């Protein structure tokens, strides 16, 4: 079912605008925005992998030492 809408849209020609300069613009705040909002998510993904990997290497290193005469 189509939606009834009331809006005003202004648009500019693609050939009247700079195309690539906007990628390297306010870079520090993009890094701030990415880190500050996603730091919990990154922790919940990296910590179990690193914690499990480290524990396995710790287990195998102590086990290898225990079997040495």
């Amino acid at each position: 079912q189509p939606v009834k809408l009331k809006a005003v849209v202004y648009a500019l020609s693609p050939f009247q605008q700079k195309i690539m300069t906007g990628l390297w613009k306010d870079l520090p705040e993009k890094i701030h925005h990415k880190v500050s909002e996603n730091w919990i998510s990154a922790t919940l993904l990296v910590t179990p992998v690193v914690g499990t990997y480290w524990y396995a290497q710790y287990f195998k290193e102590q086990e290898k030492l225990e079997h040495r005469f």
Binding site: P2, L5, S41, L45, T47, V49
Partner: protein
């Protein structure tokens, strides 16, 4: 209007179907690059078919000639090393793209209503991809190929009464032999065409209601035509994928594989390390975490059962993880768990990997057990968080 004359050719009956389904299909304007992996998976399927058809022009499905024909492909036919590496690494790229495609659907809850049939068709496609890639890996007839086919056909023996007869029927005899290799080749040429049909139905089911968007909301107010906006966005992903693919083909053609498959199959001596391709490792891990024959096969089936029952759980009316902090957190733990299971499958069956694999398997199944509970409790969120 009265269509007395012929307007744009795209609206003519010769191309009207293609125009409505490809060029002018309404698409949410806020789709991110995570919605470009569907076209990537379609391009990977085409690459696998094209390279596979030309490789089948030089491959012999005979136990006395299969290994040498692959080596003859690499050494004798001009550009045959490229076709073989494109095909061998193309299967890894296909699984990488499809794995990222599935996880986008989990994060944005794209399986939810009204897209339950799209998710269910995707699970059928995933099963077809697994069977297709597995039987293809048997074709070179290396040490990995022989011992890989030995146990998968032996999985049918978990059935108590008729399990043995299914194993011998799949083998075509009493051991993995030329009968097994010859029938695996025929099925490996057919299943990729069934995959094409399943993907077309998958695409058709999605077009009934349109694609989901990162916000998970109704999107009928801001849709744009697929061409050229999401064509040029998909083209960026295709070129970026090509750079990724080219790195593996030209500089690391054997990193995503095991050197044991370069030894001709020896039915007498098993290799000390016996593992599937990397994209089968998480399933390998769940199989080996159960200390039972039948239990291991049952858990493998329960994985696909849980993936099929996901869209039908009574869930809350909010889709995107960007508004569901608890579900969003569980998704990242599930992703870390799936990474851990793949790493565990590459490890030998001994301490501490037995305990770790058992816990990882439990966590994987806990995701599908807790999600319906989240929906039922989350139903009362609007009635408790008042303005």
């Amino acid at each position: 209007t009265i269509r007395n004359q012929r307007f744009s050719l795209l609206k003519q009956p010769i191309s009207s179907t293609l125009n409505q389904h490809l060029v002018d299909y309404p698409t949410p304007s806020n789709l991110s690059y995570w919605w470009g992996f569907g076209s990537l998976a379609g391009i990977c399927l085409v690459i696998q078919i094209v390279t596979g058809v030309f490789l089948a022009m030089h491959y012999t499905p005979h136990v006395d000639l299969a290994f040498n024909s692959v080596e003859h492909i690499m050494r004798d036919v001009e550009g045959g090393w490229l076709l073989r590496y494109m095909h061998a690494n193309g299967a890894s790229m296909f699984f990488i793209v499809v794995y990222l495609h599935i996880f986008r659907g989990l994060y944005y809850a794209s399986y939810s209503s009204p897209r339950e049939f799209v998710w269910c068709l995707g699970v059928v496609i995933f099963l077809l991809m697994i069977v297709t890639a597995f039987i293809g890996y048997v074709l070179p007839w290396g040490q990995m190929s022989f011992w890989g086919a030995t146990v998968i056909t032996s999985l049918a023996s978990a059935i108590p009464v008729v399990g043995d007869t299914i194993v011998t029927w799949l083998w075509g005899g009493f051991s993995v032999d030329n009968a097994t290799l010859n029938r695996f080749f025929s099925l490996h040429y057919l299943l990729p065409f069934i995959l094409v049909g399943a993907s077309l139905l998958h695409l058709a089911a999605l077009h009934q209601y349109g694609s989901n968007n990162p916000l998970g909301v109704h999107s009928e107010m801001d849709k744009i035509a697929f061409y050229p906006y999401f064509y040029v966005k998909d083209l960026v992903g295709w070129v970026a994928f090509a750079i990724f693919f080219s790195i593996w083909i030209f500089y690391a053609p054997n990193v995503l594989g095991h050197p044991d498959n370069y030894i001709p199959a020896n039915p007498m001596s098993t290799p000390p390390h016996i593992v599937p391709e990397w994209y089968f490792l998480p399933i390998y891990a769940i199989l080996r975490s159960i200390p039972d024959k039948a239990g291991g096969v049952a858990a493998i089936a329960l994985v696909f059962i849980c993936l099929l029952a996901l869209p039908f759980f009574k869930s809350m009316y909010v889709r995107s993880s960007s508004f569901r902090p608890i579900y969003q957190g569980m998704f990242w733990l599930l992703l870390a768990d799936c990474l851990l299971l793949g790493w565990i499958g590459c490890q030998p069956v001994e301490a501490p990997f037995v305990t770790i694999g058992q816990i990882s398997s439990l966590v994987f199944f806990l995701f599908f057990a807790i999600t319906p509970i989240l929906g039922r409790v989350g139903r009362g969120i609007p009635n408790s968080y008042t303005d």
